[PDB]
Subunit: 295 residues, 4 copies
Amino acid sequence: SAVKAARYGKDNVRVYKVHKDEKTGVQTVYEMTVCVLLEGEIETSYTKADNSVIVATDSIKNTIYITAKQNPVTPPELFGSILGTHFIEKYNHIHAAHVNIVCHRWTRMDIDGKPHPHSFIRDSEEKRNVQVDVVEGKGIDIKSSLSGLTVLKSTNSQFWGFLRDEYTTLKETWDRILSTDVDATWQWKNFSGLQEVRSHVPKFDATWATAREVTLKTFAEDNSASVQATMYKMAEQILARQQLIETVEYSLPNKHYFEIDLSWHKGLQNTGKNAEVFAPQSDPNGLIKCTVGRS
Amino acid sequence: SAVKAARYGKDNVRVYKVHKDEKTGVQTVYEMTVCVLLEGEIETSYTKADNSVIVATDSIKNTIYITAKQNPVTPPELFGSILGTHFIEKYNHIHAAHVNIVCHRWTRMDIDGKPHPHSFIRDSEEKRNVQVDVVEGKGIDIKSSLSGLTVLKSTNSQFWGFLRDEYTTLKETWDRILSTDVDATWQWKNFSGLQEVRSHVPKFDATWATAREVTLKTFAEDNSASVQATMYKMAEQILARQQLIETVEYSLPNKHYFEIDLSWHKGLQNTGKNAEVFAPQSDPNGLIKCTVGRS
Amino acid sequence: SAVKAARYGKDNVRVYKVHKDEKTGVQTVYEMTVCVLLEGEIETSYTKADNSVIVATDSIKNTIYITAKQNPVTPPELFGSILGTHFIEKYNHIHAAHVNIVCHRWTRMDIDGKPHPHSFIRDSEEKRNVQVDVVEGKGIDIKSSLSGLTVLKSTNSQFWGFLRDEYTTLKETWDRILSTDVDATWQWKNFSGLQEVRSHVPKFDATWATAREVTLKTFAEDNSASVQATMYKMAEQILARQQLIETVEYSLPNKHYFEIDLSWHKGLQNTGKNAEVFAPQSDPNGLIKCTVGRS
Amino acid sequence: SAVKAARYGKDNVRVYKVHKDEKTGVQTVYEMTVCVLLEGEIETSYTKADNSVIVATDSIKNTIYITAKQNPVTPPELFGSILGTHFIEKYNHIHAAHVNIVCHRWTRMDIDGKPHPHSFIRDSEEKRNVQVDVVEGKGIDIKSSLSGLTVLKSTNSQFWGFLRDEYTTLKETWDRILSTDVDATWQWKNFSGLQEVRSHVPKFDATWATAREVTLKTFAEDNSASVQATMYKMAEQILARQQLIETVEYSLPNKHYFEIDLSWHKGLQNTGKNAEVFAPQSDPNGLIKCTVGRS
Ligand SMILES: O=c1[nH]c(=O)c2nn[nH]c2[nH]1
Ligand SMILES: O=c1[nH]c(=O)c2nn[nH]c2[nH]1
Ligand SMILES: O=c1[nH]c(=O)c2nn[nH]c2[nH]1
Ligand SMILES: O=c1[nH]c(=O)c2nn[nH]c2[nH]1
Ligand code: NA
Ligand code: NA
Ligand code: NA
Ligand code: NA
C-alpha cells in the first residue's frame, strides 16, 4: 500500500479581533471560524510513525492567533492568503496550505438613529466565506462565497413546459412561491503570490457586495421561468461586472410550499387563485446547481 | 395507579399565509410554527383504550389550517387566542388548550431603496413567540416573548467585587466583552375571553417593539456592572411602559470571550489594555435569569 | 418593581472522569454535561449592583470539577445531590441549588468477543439524565429520566374509534407503523438529605434499568390501541416495581410514516395490505404526554 | 458566458421499506435518505428558459419511490446502481446520474434474549452510506462509507517527537486520551454496468462489516504513535482483505480532552499520572486525513 494523498491540520478555530480607533473612540469587531490543512512531505508520519515531519495541529492553532494579532483580518481573502503563505514559507517540507474561513456577522447597532461606537448585533446567519489554496510554485487560488442567504417571493415564479411521462404527477403552474437558501461562489483568477493579492485588495469587498446585490435584485425582479433560468441570469451579471472572476457557481435548494385543499371542509376555497394558506415542506427539496464561466 | 395530568396534540405544524392587496399589488407573508396541546376529560383513552374522547391530532392539524384560512394570523397573541378558544368551545369534554406559536422573520426586501411588493428575506433567526393557555372558566393567559437575539459589546462591561474564596480563580475586571443571546418574556394580565383580547389588539405589536427597543438600548448604553444589573434595568423599563404586563422574565447566557496570552511568542502583548485577539468559548456559559414584577 | 424570582449559574459544563483499577488494569470512563443554578439572598446583585452576594459562575465551574475529583460521579443521582448540598452548606445566603446532569454513553468495546480494558464506543445518543433540586430545610427532590430512545414497530399498532366530526379526514386503521422518541421521567419521594440519598444508592441504577426494560418490552409486545394506551401500561408497571417513585411522566412524539399511493403508475399497488414503501414525515408530529401517580 | 457544469435533482428524499416474511411472520425494515442529481444536455434550461429538457425534480422523487417498490433496497450499492442506471437508460439526453444514499440504523430488538419479529431500535447515529456515479459509456463508480462512529480510548495513545519551533507550546506525551468520529470511505474498482454490480452483490455487505471490524480492532489494540500512524494501519488492512477496492480514505477529527490543574485548590493533584478529571473541548479539533491506495 502507498499514501496517495494526505492532509492534516486544525478545524473550528474560533477567532475574534477588535480594532479600537483611539481618535474617534469607535470599535469594530471581526469574528471568524478558521480551518487550516497542510500537505507536503509528511507520508512518513503515516507509514513509519515519524512525527518529526509533523507541525503539531496545536501549533497551527497558535499560528492562526499570532497571525491575526500581527495582520489585518479583513478582507478574509487577504488574511487567508497571508496565513497560507506563512506555512509554505516557514516549513521547507510543507508545500500546500488550504485555508477555509467563515466570517460571522456582527453589525453595528443603530440606537436612536445613530451608529453605536461599540455595540453589535448578529443580523442573520448569512456567512461570507473564503477558501484559499496556497500551493508552492503554483501561486494562490481563492474562492469567495456567500451562504445562508434565505429568500422567498410570493408570486412571479412559474414552472411549466417540463418533460411529462409516466413518472410525472407535477401540475404545470404559472404562479407559485419560490424560496431558497443561496450559496454562491466566485473563483478568482490564479494569483502569483501575496504581492498580487495585496494589489487587488479593494476588489474583494466590492465584489462580495456586488454578488449579494445582483443576487437579491435578480431574484426579486425576474419573472422566473425556473430556478435554472433565474440563477443563470445572476451568474451572467456577476461575470460581467468583475473581469478578475473566472467562474461563478450557484447551488440553490428549491424549498417547497404546498397548497392545502380545504374544499372537504364546507367547500372552503384555498387552491389556485384562492390559495392563501400553504404548508411549507421541510423535505424533500429540489437542488439545482450551475457553474458559469467565460465563452 | 391514576392519571395525574395528561395533555396531547400536534407539534411542529408549519403554516404560511399570504395577504394580497388587490388595490396596491402589495403582498405580505407570515410564516409560523404552531403546537396545540389539549387537556380535559380524556383519562379513559389512557386507562381503558377508549378512543371516543380523542380529537385526533391529525384533526388538530386540519383545524390549525382552517383557522388560519378564516382569521387574521397577526398579532400572534390574537391568533393563538382564537385557536385555543375554538377547542374549548367546540368540544364539551375539552377544558384547556395550550397554544405555542413561533413566528419566523420574512422582512420585505428593499431593491434600489424602495420596498419590493412581493420579495422577502430572512434577516436573522430572531423569533417572536407566544404561549396562550385558554382554560375553560378561567380566561386566557398569554406570555409573549422574543428569542434568538444575539448581541455583543466590545467594552463598557465590568465585573468586580464578587465573592472570593478557596474556589475562586476568576480575576476582577473593569473592561471585558459582553455577549449574550436574549430570551425575554412578558406575561399579560389574565384576559376574560376573546372579546377582551380583541379590545387590546393594538398593544401586542407595540409592546413587542418596545421590549425589543428597550433591550437593545439598555444593553448598548449601560456601563454594565454585571449581567444581573443590566438585565434588571431592562425589565424595569418594560414594566414602566406597559401597565397590562404583570411580569417580565429574562434568561441570558453569558457567552465568554477569553484573552489569549501570546507573550511566550517573542514577548507579544495581547492581554489587558493590549488585548486585540480573543478566543470565543463555545462552552461552558454563564446562565442568568430574573423575573421582575410589580411592587 | 421587585425581583420575584432569580437564579443564576453555569450551564454546559462538560466533565469526563476515568477510574483505573490498578489490580486488573481495567479503566472505566464517565462523561457528563452539568448545569448548576443557585437561588438565595441575591436580589441586590440585580437591584443595587452589589456583586458581593455573587458566587461567580466561573467558581461554580471550578466547584464542579473539584467535586468530581473528590467524589464518585455515579450514580448521577448521588453526584448531583453531593454537588447541590455543597452550595447550600458552604454559602449562608444560598438557599437552593438546581443541578441538571446529562450522562453520555461510553460503552465498553467487545473485541473478538471479549471486553476491552480501555476502549469505548458511543452506542446511540440515548441519554440518562437527572434533575436534583436541593432546597435548604426542604430536603432533596430528584427526577431521573431517560431520553433520546428511538424505536419503531412495523405492525401491531392500531388507531380507530376516535371522534369524527367536520374537522376529521383521518381514516381509521387496524395496522400502522408506530415510531417515537421516548422521554420518560420518574420522580423520587423527597429525601431528607444526603444521608438518606446515600442509603438508597443501589436503587438508582436498578430503577433506570427497569424503566428502560419495561419501556422496550411493553412497546414491543403491546398490540397498541393508541400511543395513550400503550404509554399508560408502561408507567403502571414502573410504579409497581419501585415503591420509592411517586410519579412517572412520559412525553412521546408520534413520528408519522405515510403510505404512498402509486396506483397512478401502471396500477402499482402500495396501500393497505399491499403497502411496502412509505414516506417518513419530518413534521408535523403528534405529541402525547401523561403523568401517572399512585391512587 | 457559458454553462461549464450543471446538475440538478432532488435531495433529502426519505424512504422506508418493509419486507414481510409470510412463512415466519418476521418483518425487516430499511430506512434511507436519498439524493439524485442528473447531468446531460440540459444547458438550454438555464440559458434559454427551455424547460422541455427538464425531468422535473418531483418526477425524480416519484421515481425513487417506484424503484424502491420494484427492487430490493439492500445492499445500498445495488439499489443506487439500479436507480442511477434507470435515468441514463430512460432519458436520451441525460448522460450521468449521481446517487447518494444514507442508511439509518433500525436494529431488531431483543426482548428476553430473543429477536423480536417486528420491533426495532435506533442504536446510534452511525450511518452506512454510498455514492454511486453512473456515467453513460463509462460504467458505474461506487464509493461506500461508514460515518458517525464515535470512539474513545482512555490510554495507549502517545504523541511525542513532533517538530518544535517558536510556534510550539504543546508538551510531548506518552499517555493521553484519544477520541474521534470515524469517517471511512472505500472506493470500488469501476464496474462496467449493472450486470457486473449484480455479480458482486455479496461483497458489499461483507466489505462494510470488515471495514467496521478492522477500524474498531485497530483502534482498540494499536499503541498509537499518532492519529496518522493508527489510521494508516486501518487502511492497509482493508486493502489487504478486499482486492476489488482501489483506495481507502479516512477523515478523523482528534477531539481533545484537556487535563485540569487543580493544584491551586488545596494542592489537589489532577495532572499527569494523577489525572482523573478532564475537560472535553468542543472546539477547536484536529482534522487528519489520508487516502491509501495500492503500490
Ligand atoms: O495524533 C496527533 N496528530 C497530530 O498531527 C497532532 N497535532 N497535535 N496533536 C496531535 N495528535
Ligand atoms: O396513537 C395516536 N393517538 C392520537 O391521539 C392520535 N391522533 N391521530 N393519530 C393518533 N394516534
Ligand atoms: O456578569 C456576570 N455575572 C456573573 O454572575 C458572573 N460570574 N462570573 N462572571 C460573571 N459575569
Ligand atoms: O424551478 C424548478 N426547477 C426544476 O427543475 C423543477 N422540478 N420540479 N419543480 C421545479 N422547479
Ligand atoms: Na515549503
Ligand atoms: Na369545552
Ligand atoms: Na445556605
Ligand atoms: Na441517456
